[PDB]
Structure formats: C-alpha cells, structure tokens
Amino acid sequence: KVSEQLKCCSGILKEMFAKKHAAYAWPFYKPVDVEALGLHDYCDIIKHPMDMSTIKSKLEAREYRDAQEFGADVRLMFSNCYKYNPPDHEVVAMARKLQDVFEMRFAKMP
C-alpha cells in the first residue's frame, strides 16, 4: 500500500514537472531565490520554504514515510505562495492552476 502510494506520488510530481504545465508550474520548480528576486521580507513571513525540487529530492532519498507526508509538502509549497502574495497576484493564479493538477491526481490515489 505505502510503496504503491509513494510510487503514485512520484508519478504526480513528474506530471507537475511536465512541459504541458510549464507555463504555470515554472515558478515552483526551484527554491525561491529571494536575493535574485529582491524579496527582502520572504524569510520573515515564510518559515518553512518548499518547492518541487526539494520534494523530488525527498522522494528519491525515500524521506516520506507515507503519501500524506508528500501531500503536506506540496500543499505547504502552495500555501507559502498564498500566504506571501496578495490574492490578485500573477503567481497566485499560477499556483492555483498547478494545484488543480495536484489535487485531482492526489485524490485518485489507490
């Protein structure tokens, strides 16, 4: 069961990285580069930063003990985005589009 669900989770992340979703997924590929982006207050507001590459590394290092732990990291990524940015921000619109993809696949896990 657990190995099966983590297998599915790897398939979900792979979909999220796929060219099909690149136009709204790209901001989540890597850790937020606060210095490059000039986000002086990002670490004041966001205590547990998360991104798709860190999630990929954690999967491949077999650091998730079940699918819900993986699920909580993905949702943390998205929540950090919603916490930091105003609701009308361009990056929030992208986050919700990508969360469409995640939530639909995640719910249909065996």
Ligand SMILES: Cc1nnc2n1-c1ccccc1C(c1ccccc1)=N[C@H]2NC(=O)OCc1ccccc1
């Ligand atoms: C993820 C995530 N969470 N927040 C943010 N990203 C993020 C992470 C990585 C990369 C981009 C972003 C974008 C973003 C994404 C898409 C469009 C616009 C902004 N916006 C970032 N937020 C912000 O205020 O950037 C200022 C800004 C605004 C405009 C330009 C430069 C800097």
